[PDB]
Amino acid sequence: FYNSTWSYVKHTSTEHTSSSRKRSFFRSSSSSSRSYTSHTNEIHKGKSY
Amino acid sequence: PLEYNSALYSRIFDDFGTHYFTSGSLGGVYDLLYQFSSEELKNSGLTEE
């Protein structure tokens, strides 16, 4: 007999944040938020008797 | 046959063999081979970045 078992998790997140305020008698605000997540889970089993 | 004829005698040893027991021992033979083989691997890995 052999009993074989693999288990894998990859968790990734990436984020971006931005702010930009300006004044020149005209006034402005500008802002951006970007978030990415990639998540992978694999489980593999082989059992022989 | 009364006259020697190799074949017809040889038959004798075919059927009854060549010897008989003048003495001996009777009983029983207990003959055992047991052989166990086992092998385990474990792997654990964690990264935080």
From Swiss-Prot, chain A:
Compositionally biased spans, kind Low complexity: 26-35
Posttranslational modification: C-, N- and O-glycosylated. O-glycosylated with core 1 or possibly core 8 glycans.
Highest taxon above the source species: Eukaryota
Glycosylated residues in this chain: 3
Region annotation Disordered: where it falls in the sequence: 20-41
Cell compartment(s), UniProt: Secreted; Target cell membrane
Related illness: Complement component 7 deficiency: A rare defect of the complement classical pathway associated with susceptibility to severe recurrent infections, predominantly by Neisseria gonorrhoeae or Neisseria meningitidis.
Subunit annotation: Monomer or dimer; as a C5b-7 complex it can also form multimeric rosettes. Component of the membrane attack complex (MAC), composed of complement C5b, C6, C7, C8A, C8B, C8G and multiple copies of the pore-forming subunit C9.
Sequence similarity: Belongs to the complement C6/C7/C8/C9 family.
Function, in words: Component of the membrane attack complex (MAC), a multiprotein complex activated by the complement cascade, which inserts into a target cell membrane and forms a pore, leading to target cell membrane rupture and cell lysis. The MAC is initiated by proteolytic cleavage of C5 into complement C5b in response to the classical, alternative, lectin and GZMK complement pathways. The complement pathways consist in a cascade of proteins that leads to phagocytosis and breakdown of pathogens and signaling that strengthens the adaptive immune system. C7 serves as a membrane anchor.
Identification of the protein by name: Complement component C7
Organism: Homo sapiens (Human)
Name of encoding gene: C7
Shown residues within the full chain: 200 to 248 of 843
Swiss-Prot record, chain B:
Protein name per Swiss-Prot or TrEMBL: Complement component C6
Organism, as annotated: Homo sapiens (Human)
Family: Belongs to the complement C6/C7/C8/C9 family.
Segment of the intact protein contained: 346 to 394 of 934
Assembly and binders: Component of the membrane attack complex (MAC), composed of complement C5b, C6, C7, C8A, C8B, C8G and multiple copies of the pore-forming subunit C9.
Localisation: Secreted; Target cell membrane
Changes after translation: All cysteine residues are assumed to be cross-linked to one another. Individual modules containing an even number of conserved cysteine residues are supposed to have disulfide linkages only within the same module.
Glycosites: 47
Disease implicated: Complement component 6 deficiency: A rare defect of the complement classical pathway associated with susceptibility to severe recurrent infections, predominantly by Neisseria gonorrhoeae or Neisseria meningitidis.
Primary role: Component of the membrane attack complex (MAC), a multiprotein complex activated by the complement cascade, which inserts into a target cell membrane and forms a pore, leading to target cell membrane rupture and cell lysis. The MAC is initiated by proteolytic cleavage of C5 into complement C5b in response to the classical, alternative, lectin and GZMK complement pathways. The complement pathways consist in a cascade of proteins that leads to phagocytosis and breakdown of pathogens and signaling that strengthens the adaptive immune system.
Highest taxon in the source lineage: Eukaryota
